[PDB]
């Protein structure tokens, strides 16, 4: 029914200040349905990514006005009312699938006419493991009550799309792991330094990507804020 669970957008879109802009997410599955509580983000260069709609409509707070979200028919749809150059960025839409997230993958928008944050999640820049080890890496969550939050963790692997991996939710300890990452990830948190984090182990090339944090809860705007992003190499 759902394990081969597919979310497909528009490979790119063009566009130019003030036109508007209609992003589509549609879901293998059947519909796209309220229960998918869609998010859309948006990635920007050097992997640096902003939430703008969760739960399938809510724009998050300080997103412009410009961005909306619905359902419409059977897809979930992301309008820019009067695009501007700084759109000009990979949009990914995020379907919930009962026990996972799974992202669409990725629209990339380009905006002809080219030329701090209260929350912040802290990722370190760059780790480098041998294969066949482990690594671990931490996102301490500044500027925002972190036990009220989960972290969700996030890849994405070089030049392609985002791939969820688990989440912990610091309060219950409750741990989700996607079945892509049950044996590649152990997630942990401590409050008192509001730190989570991901141990990957069983290291290959493969492993080579960017890991990202970000944050989510019950009915909130998941991934509204999101880490750096960490590049792991693996490599003899
Ligand atoms: O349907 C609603 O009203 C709200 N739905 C959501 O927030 C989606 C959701 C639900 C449960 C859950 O464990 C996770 N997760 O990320 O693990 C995400």
């Known amino acids: 029914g759902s394990a081969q669970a597919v979310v497909t957008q528009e490979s790119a879109l063009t566009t130019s200040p003030g036109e508007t802009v209609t992003l589509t997410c549609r879901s293998s599955?059947?519909?796209?349905?309220?229960?998918?509580?869609v998010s859309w983000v948006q990635e920007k260069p050097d992997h640096l990514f902003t939430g703008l709609i969760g739960?399938?409509?809510n724009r998050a707070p300080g997103v412009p006005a410009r961005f909306s979200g619905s359902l419409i028919g059977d897809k979930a749809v992301l309008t820019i009312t009067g695009a501007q150059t700084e759109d000009e960025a990979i949009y990914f839409c995020?379907?919930?699938?009962?026990?996972?997230?799974?992202f669409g993958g990725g629209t990339k928008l380009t905006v002809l006419g080219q030329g701090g944050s209260q929350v912040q999640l802290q990722q370190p820049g760059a780790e480098l493991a041998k294969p066949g080890a482990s690594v671990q890496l931490s996102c301490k969550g500044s500027?925002?009550?972190?036990?009220?939050?989960?972290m969700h963790w996030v890849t994405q692997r070089p030049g392609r799309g985002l791939e969820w991996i688990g989440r912990?939710?610091?309060?219950?300890?409750?741990?989700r792991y996607d079945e892509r990452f049950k044996t590649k990830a152990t997630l942990t948190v401590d409050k008192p330094s509001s730190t989570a984090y991901m141990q990957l182990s069983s290291l290959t090339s493969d492993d080579s990507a960017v890991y990202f944090c970000?944050?989510?809860?019950?009915?909130?705007?998941?991934?509204?804020?999101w880490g750096q992003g960490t590049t792991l190499t693996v490599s003899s």
């Open positions: 500027g925002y009550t972190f036990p009220n939050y989960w």
């Open positions: 912990i939710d610091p309060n219950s300890g409750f741990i």
């Open positions: 739960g399938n409509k």
């Open positions: 995020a379907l919930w699938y009962s026990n996972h997230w799974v």
């Open positions: 599955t059947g519909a796209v349905i309220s229960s998918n509580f």
């Open positions: 970000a944050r989510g809860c019950y009915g909130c705007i998941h991934f509204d804020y």
